Amino acid sequence: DIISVALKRHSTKAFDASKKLTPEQAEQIKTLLQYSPSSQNSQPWHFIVASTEEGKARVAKSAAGNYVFSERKMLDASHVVVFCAKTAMDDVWLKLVVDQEDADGRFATPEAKAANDKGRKFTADMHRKDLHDDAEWMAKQVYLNVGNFLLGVAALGLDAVPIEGFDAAILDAEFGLKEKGYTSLVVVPVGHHSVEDFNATLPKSRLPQNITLTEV
Amino acid sequence: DIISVALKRHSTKAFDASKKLTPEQAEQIKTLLQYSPSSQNSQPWHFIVASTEEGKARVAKSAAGNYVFSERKMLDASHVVVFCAKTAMDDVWLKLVVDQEDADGRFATPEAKAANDKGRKFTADMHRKDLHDDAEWMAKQVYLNVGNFLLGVAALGLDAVPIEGFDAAILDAEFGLKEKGYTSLVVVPVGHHSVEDFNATLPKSRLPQNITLTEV
């Protein structure tokens, strides 16, 4: 069941480059990225899915030099996903989101729609104006998406590793992200592990629930 | 089929208070919280799982003021999880983590263990001493945990809603979290939706991939 998946999945240390996602799989990973939940359905994200050798090479520039171990993971894997967050939440994005909810039939009336818009605007304005944490707020949503994604791709029977070990300034510049209003946070190579993946056979380690968990 | 799960899950707006998790389910949700990944296996989190009437009422003090719409969700669900992040990363936590990985048998040699420790410390130091973003870094891991959790609980056939709409100051004070070194980020009621959950029958809405996703 899904608990088997949770207990069996791992962070892949090495990928077999000859194993490629099926066409179906390549679509499903995109479906996972798209359908993650987010606060206010704000969806404050951009994904780059590199499946060509040259696409993956562009992402792997971000690891060259200081993050050399990350480099190979990015090149060997079939598909490599860069999760990016918005750097600012603009009125244009807020309107885009509510108008899509409208188009998808989520509002019975014009009043329902305007209430939804107003509530989202209030939440966004609070983060920006008062808490001064809108960048962080949006990045948190991208991380939630990542969590969703790692379980999803494990459940598809795929291997993956989340990577913070890359240079976001280099990745941002490689893809012109800053001027488009995004920044790269996590890279996730997806594929099938090789026999050089020593982590595939190691026991999983987590702290005991008596440390991390209180029942009331 | 995890894709079906992702496409069919939703944020529950109303719970049937008579429908409780099975005993086995109550254990599975705890397994999902525990076995999420995190950067460096840093596991910078504390969970409160409220399953009693008194426990849920304590959590629902946080649904005051602007957040009164969260109150019923927190009270009527079977189980309510509070995701908390550490407020600071300490060397004691770092040691706790590596010693657990050692106990679980992740390290062939003393050198392997010390290399793992030193790598974790470098990453942690970069956050807390250079970037000064360790609070955000750890919160991002908690949000990853949340995303894993929402898909997992949906795959168990359970309903849930992630809530940022609560007063963290009140929830923190109610549970003495600040002095214990934690703060509350997301509340997730888990259970079964009622026929009043209007969101169960509404269409799901996301932005189109031609906005959110580039293939390279």
Ligand SMILES: Cc1cc2nc3c(=O)[nH]c(=O)nc-3n(C[C@H](O)[C@H](O)[C@H](O)COP(=O)(O)O)c2cc1C
């Ligand atoms: C946000 C994030 C960043 C990570 N960055 C790296 C990375 O840069 N390199 C790496 O080898 N593993 C990385 N990991 C993998 C973790 O070490 C791993 O998730 C953790 O040790 C738990 O093991 P598991 O993923 O096999 O359950 C990262 C994990 C997460 C969640």
Ligand SMILES: Cc1cc2nc3c(=O)[nH]c(=O)nc-3n(C[C@H](O)[C@H](O)[C@H](O)COP(=O)(O)O)c2cc1C
């Ligand atoms: C971090 C987070 C916080 C949220 N906070 C709330 C909340 O306080 N109240 C609420 O009714 N829904 C809340 N939501 C639900 C979102 O509106 C929902 O995820 C989004 O509209 C997408 O719809 P879906 O979850 O049904 O796919 C939250 C979602 C997330 C991811």
